[PDB]
């Protein structure tokens, strides 16, 4: 009943990022993805697509400004028969279900 209710689930991520600067101005920048899949056969997972641009600059000797912008696109799905007692589901199921 354990293999009937739980699986080995793959997780994958990757990133590309640029940094550098010059006189009085700096920038950070990255893009990346993330995809983790839950080990419960009852479906659960989390995945995001990430972007970030960080920036700051000395305008003159009296003013200096900055800005860092981020954002993503994410699919979260949460398995939620857990923490509750149901006849053939969850870790409670892998133990209680007759063989």
């Amino acid at each position: 009943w354990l293999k009937a209710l739980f699986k080995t689930a793959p997780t994958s991520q990757g990133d590309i990022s640029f940094s550098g600067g010059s006189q009085g101005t700096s920038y950070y920048a990255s893009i990346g993805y993330f995809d983790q899949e839950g080990m419960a056969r009852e479906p659960a997972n989390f995945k995001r697509y990430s972007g970030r641009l960080n920036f700051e600059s000395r305008i003159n000797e009296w003013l200096k400004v900055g800005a860092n912008l981020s954002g993503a696109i994410a699919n979260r799905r949460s398995a939620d028969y857990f923490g509750k007692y149901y006849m053939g589901s969850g870790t409670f199921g892998v133990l209680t279900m007759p063989r």
Binding site: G83, K84, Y85, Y86, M87, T96
Partner: peptide, 13 residues
């Protein structure tokens, strides 16, 4: 079914 035999209820989370 839904075997609520005991099910002592979580008080801390």
């Amino acid at each position: 079914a839904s075997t609520t035999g005991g099910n002592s209820q979580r008080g801390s989370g």
